[PDB]
Structures are given as C-alpha cells and as structure tokens.
Amino acid sequence: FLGLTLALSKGRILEETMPLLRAAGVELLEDPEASRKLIFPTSNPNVRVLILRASDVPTYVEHGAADFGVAGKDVLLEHGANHVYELLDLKIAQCKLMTAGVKDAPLPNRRLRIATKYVNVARAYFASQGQQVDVIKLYGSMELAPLVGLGDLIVDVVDTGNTLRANGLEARDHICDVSSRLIVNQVSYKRKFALLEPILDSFKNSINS
Amino acid sequence: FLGLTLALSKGRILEETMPLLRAAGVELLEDPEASRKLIFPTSNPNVRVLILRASDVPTYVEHGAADFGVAGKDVLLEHGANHVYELLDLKIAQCKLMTAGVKDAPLPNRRLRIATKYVNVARAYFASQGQQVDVIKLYGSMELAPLVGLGDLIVDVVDTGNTLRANGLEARDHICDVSSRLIVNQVSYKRKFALLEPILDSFKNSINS
C-alpha cells in the first residue's frame, strides 16, 4: 500500500473528524463502529483508515504503521509527542483534564494518592502545585476509585461533569483544555508530503470556520 | 461498609462467576452490563460487587479497595501477583496466551519487535526462548499490528483462534494456559476471614464438579 494510512478512534473523534475528511475528498464506505474490519478503504484510493483505541493512535503514528492520525491532547501529553509532529489543533472533541474527588471531602495530611490512567500528566500537574504524589495506574472507570478509597483524587478527562456529579464527585482543579490534534509521522511528513499537503491544507481551511 | 467487596469484570468472567456466586448465596439484583451504577448490591447484604476493567481487578484487590476478586491469569502475570494471594483456580474463561504473526511470514534476522498489551509476559516468554526483544505497548486490537508492520509478532489471549484466522494471522507459539483465579487482599484475608471462608469453601466445592 503506497498511499496514506490515517489512524482514528471510535466515538466523538471519528464522528467529528468525518466532516473534515469529507471536505478533503475522503469518505468512509461503511460505518466502522459496526464492522470487524481493521483497515477501512475510503472514497480516495490513496487513503485508508485504521480504527484504534485512542491511547494507541500516537503509537501507530510514531512507528509509521500509520502516516498520520487524530489523537486527543490528553493522550499525546500522557504518551509523549516528541517523536511525531503535531501540525493542527482541530478543535474537536473538546474537554478538560481535571482533578476530582468526593464532594466536600477534605484532603489528607500526607502524600496524596492519585488514581488515574494519566500517570505522567498527574505527576507533572501535581509537581507544578509543589506536590510529590503517589499514582495508582488504572485503565478505566476512574469515578469509582474515590468512592471505595482507592486514591484521594483522580485525574480524568471531563466534558459535562455529569458522570462526576452522578457519583457524588466534584472537580477540584482544572489542569488543561484538551482537544483532538492532527499528528504526522516524522518520516511520512518528508517522504509523502505531496499526498499529505492537500489534505492538511483542507483541514486547515475547514477549521478556520 | 463492613462487608466484603468483590471485584469482577464484564463478559465471560461475570457470566461464568455468577453460578459460583449463586451456589454461595450471592446473587446480583440487576444486570451490571446494562447499568451506570459502579457498586452493585447483592442478595447478601454482606457482599457488594464492583464491575471493573479486567486489568484493574488486581489493582483494586491489592490496595484493599476490593477484598477479593476474580482475575484472569493473563492479567495477574502481567500485573504481578506478589501482593495478593491467589487462592483458587476457578477453571473459568479458559484461553491461551500465545504468540502470533502473519500466516507463513518469515521472522526477520534481528531483534524481534513484539506488539502487545502483555509487555512483561512477552519479555519473560521470549527470554525463556533465548531472545531479548523490543516490545511495543498496545491497549487493544492486537490483530491489526502485524498487518500494518507494527511489530513482527503479537502476544495475546487466544480462545477459538477465529479473530486471528479472520485477519490472516496464525498462532506461532503457546505460552501458557489461562483461566480466571480467585484473589484476596492479604489484610482482608486475615481481618475478614469469617466472612470469606464460607464463600471460599462454596467456590471450592463448586469447582470440584
């Protein structure tokens, strides 16, 4: 396959990327959410799509298994973005990285334990607050952890805050805003620029409105 | 909450644990697969259930946020089981850890790159084969990696082999058999033994047939 391979993930990222792809002459030929297929063709024979877990998008792009991708800033910060280029803030799937805990619960007088998927982000953020913290690495359902005493706080992505509120948690601190970003493999950017450039230009034009 | 907190995960583990719980006088009052609730009551007021991602079950049990749990051997090997007790092989959700790659594809003459969620298991298994390997940490859909050149092999859990076969992959090596195990927090085992013992005994009796 001599074309470009685009790494996306399911849900909001796929949903909100598709219009940008449509304006650039790229359309999926079926709903990937309903398929066992791993690699998907498009209306453009020079572009194919991978549907990955959000956390794996930087990995595939870094290694060149995908030439470019759409990854949330949260994933990029946690994974590390030193071995891809971030070309565009696409302003999609916007949310916040935040700390949260049980509503009105006092912080303990000791090293805090932070339950999170975002272990690197958590250590860095708390370091900026003057705190060395213990981190408990979790893979999902962060909202449960404070309820059963696993960790004093969580770090997670928050959009509406409804999950938090439904579970008797409240956001404590805003860490940073998060949006999905167009990343490119550093070799693909050089070797396949003629294929990338018009797509990149279309995306840039689309995001300007 | 003074009772026991049991950590389970969705799908086959939940499905196949429920009969064992039923024989021990513990029944869920609704289908957790259909609910936003995080902690679930049971027919026994001394037992509640957490529905976690499989990878997080050892974590919750180790820290004492759950007193006991059902975790796959694959997760235990990868996480490390030094800070829980493994009491029972429940013989449920049986499968194999295996290596796999593209059907009939020759191995490269260099350090192999292993794409997997099971980074620790992969390094240990290949070390037993006389090989130092590079590992690429992935979070899902392992079957894709060899198709797009990410890694030379994968390590994954295989049951039927259908996913592998559907994607033009074949299992290369059998690493070990995997089944779900009853694990207990090391303090809970001492402090709450009177609550645990009859449940543990029931499970043992059930698995004997």
Residues 6+ apart with CB under 8 A from B209: none
The alpha-carbon gap from B9 to the nearest alpha carbon of chain A, in Å, equals 12
Report strand pairing: B169-184 vs B68-72.
antiparallel
Letter for the amino acid at B53?
R
The alpha-carbon gap from B92 to the nearest alpha carbon of chain A, in Å, equals 23
Please check whether residues B7 and B72 belong to one and the same domain.
yes
Please check whether residues B128 and B162 belong to one and the same domain.
yes
Residue pairs between chains A and B whose CB atoms are closer than 8 Å: 77
Letter for the amino acid at A152?
D
In this structure, are residues B30 and B40 in contact, taking their beta carbons and an 8 Å threshold?
yes
* Domain ranges, residue A167: 95-176
Identify any residues that bridge with B113 across adjacent strands, giving them in sequence order. B134
In this structure, are residues A184 and A90 in contact, taking their beta carbons and an 8 Å threshold?
no
**Max intra-chain CA distance, chain A:** 60
Identify any residues that bridge with B47 across adjacent strands, giving them in sequence order. B4
d(CA B9, CA B53): 6
d(CA A207, CA A11): 20
Q: A interface toward B at CB cutoff 8 Å? A: 5, 36, 38-39, 50, 52-53, 55-56, 59-60, 63-66, 136-141, 143-145, 147-150, 166-167
- Per the structure, how many domains does chain A have? 2
The alpha-carbon gap from A205 to the nearest alpha carbon of chain B, in Å, equals 30
Please check whether residues B133 and B182 belong to one and the same domain.
no
CA distances to B49, B85, B145, B158, B192 from B68, in Å: 10, 9, 35, 26, 11
Taking the CA of residue B119 as centre, how many other CA atoms within 13 Å lie in the half-sphere pointing to its CB?
A: 8
Taking the CA of residue A97 as centre, how many other CA atoms within 13 Å lie in the half-sphere pointing to its CB?
A: 24
Identify any residues that bridge with B134 across adjacent strands, giving them in sequence order. B113
Tokens describing residue B97: 């850890």
Q: How was this structure determined?
A: X-ray
Please check whether residues B37 and B61 belong to one and the same domain.
yes
Cα first-last separation, chain A: 34
Residue pointed to by tokens 């398929």: A35
8 Å CB contact of A38 and B141: yes
Please check whether residues B129 and B59 belong to one and the same domain.
no
Tokens describing residue B119: 């980074």
Residue pointed to by tokens 């860490």: A175
The minimal CB distance from B55 to the residues A53, A139, A147 is found for: A139
Nearest alpha-carbon partner for A55 in A144, A118, A145, A137: A118
* 3-class secondary-structure state, position A65: coil
Helices (H), B45-160: 57-63, 73-79, 119-128
Please check whether residues A42 and A126 belong to one and the same domain.
no
User: Exposed, middle or buried: residue B25 (CB in 10 Å: 0-12, 13-18, 19+)?
Assistant: middle
The alpha-carbon gap from B168 to the nearest alpha carbon of chain A, in Å, equals 12
Please check whether residues B84 and B187 belong to one and the same domain.
yes
For A148, nearest residue in chain B (alpha carbons): B65
Please check whether residues B1 and B88 belong to one and the same domain.
yes
Please check whether residues A113 and A182 belong to one and the same domain.
no
Residue pointed to by tokens 């024979």: A45
Q: How many residues does chain A have?
A: 209
Residue pointed to by tokens 């030439």: A67
Residues 6+ apart with CB under 8 A from A57: A7, A8, A9, A66, A69, A70, A71, A75, A183
User: What CATH number corresponds to the domain at position B189?
Assistant: 3.40.190.10
Please check whether residues B172 and B109 belong to one and the same domain.
yes
Nearest alpha-carbon partner for B116 in B79, B65, B153: B153
8 Å CB contact of B56 and A5: no
Please check whether residues A126 and A71 belong to one and the same domain.
no
Identify any residues that bridge with B8 across adjacent strands, giving them in sequence order. B51
8 Å CB contact of B53 and A166: no
Dihedrals phi, psi of B41, to nearest 5 degrees = -75, 170
Please check whether residues A110 and A195 belong to one and the same domain.
no
